């Protein structure tokens, strides 16, 4: 086990998962001074993201996040390798401190953060195999702020109620996953980093979209308060909140940007 | 051993020092969501802070910071108990990133940070004993920004060149430690936390002053370049830079303020 609080929290991960105390750790502060424009960062293409509404996709409370299993026919086109989707999941704070994005922008958190996890399918059969290999994974990260209601996000959040406890699964009818991405996906930050959860392998190509999406206060409240990270029968039940990693030191490394201003 | 970089860096401290992986860790990011004004918080009085120029105080490179020993006749008044001084020391960044404060405000680092450590001498015979009990230590934190030349801070800094390596020591004649504190000490943040270094005991009552002080670019540079974490005879020397801990999860704490925000 590992958690985001108490003795088994993030400061303790490295005991059993050595990479968590290694180099190239994510997430990081994306700040003006370490940004470098890279004109060679072209727009990524999202292939096969339009999932059939006739098909069901598995949503799970895994005790660390809520995760939607995704088919490997979704892929990113534009990186050195083909990266095929495995799942998406989210990171959030709590109603007292609703700023639980992993990445920060010039020191500031967003409300929450979505991650679409893909694996190098040119070389590996799955994320688990890819996860300890150089450039084995690629994550799209979407920063989330409070604003207008988001129907597309609600295609997930309307199901939170059915995955209240660790181990529970629901079906989510397919929708266009691209609807979850912000405007101007052409604008992004790019850096080499790590899984933000154990085993924290430094094997992830990060793309964080420059622009956040908005969800409503009620939506955010629901994400923050719907789930427990414990099995239903657990004698000490725990709310699933603050399930984000503190930002990591990122020394004399650059973050590349697809935009110059 | 422990450091701020590499295999023995902060994500690894918990491997040797259980409390670093525990609750109530410092430092923290000061921001509006987790602040509560408390009208009950009155100004501190700084007693015996004007050290005699005819007495000498030991300055040591301990490998983690430069520390000045302080006499127990130096004490703060205004807490529930007498807190007597034990030592002061600093945390800083590096020439390429001169923002190494430990506490942050709205996610922003200040250039550096001074800690003045005291122990509850009313209850405990010494700092080590105090450090195992709740509220056993009280630390005053002064945030340091690049600014005007500061003659008071030079009373420390002018001695850096004699404590270049771990274990090296020098005598500093007493001066007024009050001169190292900011404007309007009446305004501060107050919260329960931990040593920011191993062994990270959660036994510190923290006061961070609202107002920063200033030292010059030349003084900041001297601090960031004069010192080594290693003994002079170490086969692999290491500059003493970036000796600050990342900010820490709140663990349901509030921070109380003596001013309204
Ligand atoms: N946060 S993240 O850096 O995007 C990220 C989070 C998770 C994740 O879900 N971890 C469990 C928490 O939901 C995963 S993973 O595919 O479940 C995975 C876990 C362990 C070993 C190999 C692979 C991959 C990434 Cl890249
Ligand atoms: N950073 S801090 O939270 O102000 C802080 C830093 C240090 C410290 O010097 N650590 C070594 C390097 O800075 C100390 S201590 O006097 O060495 C100490 C250690 C163990 C038991 C009792 C006392 C106490 C505090 Cl409160
Ligand atoms: Zn994630
Ligand atoms: Zn300190």
Q: What angle do CA A180, A55, A118 make, to 5 degrees?
A: 50
Q: Which domain holds residue B162?
A: 1-261
Task: Give CA torsion, residues A87, A188, A91, A150, to 10 deg.
Answer: -90
Enter the tokens of residue A204.
């992830």
**End-to-end Cα distance, chain B:** 41
Instruction: Give a three-class secondary structure readout of chain B.
Output: CCCCCCCCCCCCHHHCCHHHHCCCCCCCEECHHHEEECCCCCCCEEECCECCCCCEEEEEECCCCEEEECCCCCEEECCCCCEEEEEEEEEECECCECCCCCCEECCEECCEEEEEEEEECCCCCCHHHHCCCCCCEEEEEEEEEECCCCHHHHHHHCCHHHCCCCCCEEEEECCEHHHHCCCCCCCEEEEEECCCCCCCCCCEEEEEECCCEEECHHHHHHHHHCCECCCCCCCCCCECCCCCCCCCCCCCCCEEECCCC
DSSP letter for A131, please: T
Pocket of ligand 2 (CB under 6 A): B 62, 64-65, 67, 86-87, 89, 115, 117, 127-128, 131, 137, 139, 195-197, 199, 204
Do B15 and B242 touch, CB atoms closer than 8 A? no
Ramachandran category for residue B53: left, alpha or beta (phi over 0 → left; psi -120 to 50 → alpha)? alpha
In terms of DSSP bridges, do strands A29-30 and A104-105 run parallel, antiparallel, or are they unpaired? parallel
**End-to-end Cα distance, chain A:** 43
CB-based contacts of A228, cutoff 8 Å, min separation 6 = A61, A164, A165, A166, A237, A238, A239, A240
Question: Chain B within 8 Å of A44 (Cβ-Cβ)?
Answer: no
What residue's CA is closest to ligand 2, atom 4?
A: B115
Task: Give CA torsion, residues B145, B147, B152, B157, to 10 deg.
Answer: 70
Looking at residue A248, which CATH number applies to its domain? 3.10.200.10
Question: Chain B within 8 Å of A235 (Cβ-Cβ)?
Answer: no
Is residue B159 annotated as a catalytic residue, yes or no? no
DSSP letter for A7, please: G
Beta carbons within 10 angstroms of residue A232's beta carbon: 11
Closest CA to B93 of B158, B29, B5, B11: B5
Q: What angle do CA B249, B251, B252 make, to 5 degrees?
A: 125
Q: Residue-wise over A180-199: b if at least 16 C-beta within 10 A, else e?
A: bbbeebeebbbbbbbbbbbb
In terms of DSSP bridges, do strands A112-120 and A188-193 run parallel, antiparallel, or are they unpaired? unpaired
Q: Give the integer Cα–Cα distance in Å for A30 and A255.
A: 7
Stated as kind and residue range, the H or E segment containing A115 is strand A112-120
Closest CA to A246 of B182, B25, B57: B25
Q: Give the integer Cα–Cα distance in Å for A215 and A195.
A: 25
Q: Minimal Cα distance from A98: which residue of B?
A: B33
In the numeric block, the tokens 């401190």 are attached to A97
- Tell me whether residue B13 is exposed, middle or buried, using C-beta atoms within 10 angstroms of its C-beta: 0 to 12, 13 to 18, 19 or more: buried
Enter the tokens of residue A46.
């999202």
Kindly give the number of the ligand 2 atom that is closest to the alpha carbon of B204: 26
Do A167 and A231 touch, CB atoms closer than 8 A? yes
**Radius of gyration of the CA atoms of chain A, in A:** 17
Q: Give the integer Cα–Cα distance in Å for A53 and B112.
A: 55
Q: How far is CA B256 from CA B37, B68, B217, in A?
A: 6, 29, 32
- For chain B, the domain total comes to 1
DSSP letter for A64, please: S
Enter the tokens of residue B68.
């000045």
In terms of DSSP bridges, do strands A108-109 and B108-109 run parallel, antiparallel, or are they unpaired? unpaired
Stated as kind and residue range, the H or E segment containing A153 is helix A151-157
Q: Which of B64, B75, B103, B118 is catalytic?
A: B64
């Amino acid at each position: 086990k590992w958690t985001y609080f108490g003795p088994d929290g993030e400061n303790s991960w490295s005991k059993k998962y050595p990479s968590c105390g290694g180099l190239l750790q994510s997430p990081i502060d994306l700040h003006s001074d370490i940004l470098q424009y890279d004109a060679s960062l072209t727009p990524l293409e999202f292939q096969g993201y339009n999932l059939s509404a006739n098909k069901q996709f598995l949503l799970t409370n895994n005790g660390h996040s809520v995760k939607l299993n995704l088919p490997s026919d979704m892929h990113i086109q534009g990186l050195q390798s083909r990266y095929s989707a495995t799942q998406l999941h989210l990171h959030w704070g709590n109603p007292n401190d609703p700023h639980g994005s992993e990445h920060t922008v010039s020191g500031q958190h967003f409300a929450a953060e979505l991650h679409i996890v893909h694996y190098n399918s040119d070389l590996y059969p799955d994320a688990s195999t890819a996860s300890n290999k150089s450039e084995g994974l690629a994550v799209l990260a979407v920063l989330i702020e409070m604003g207008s209601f988001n129907p597309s996000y609600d295609k997930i959040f309307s199901h939170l109620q059915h995955v209240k406890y660790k181990g529970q699964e629901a079906f989510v009818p397919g929708f266009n996953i691209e609807e979850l991405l912000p405007e101007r996906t052409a604008e992004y930050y790019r850096y080499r980093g790590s899984l933000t959860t154990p085993p924290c392998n430094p094997t992830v190509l990060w793309t964080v979209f420059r622009n956040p999406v908005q969800i409503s206060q009620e939506q955010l409240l629901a994400l923050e308060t719907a789930l427990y990270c414990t099995h239903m029968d657990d004698p000490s039940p725990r709310e699933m909140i603050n399930n984000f990693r503190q930002v990591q030191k990122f020394d004399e490394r650059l973050v590349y940007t697809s935009f110059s201003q």
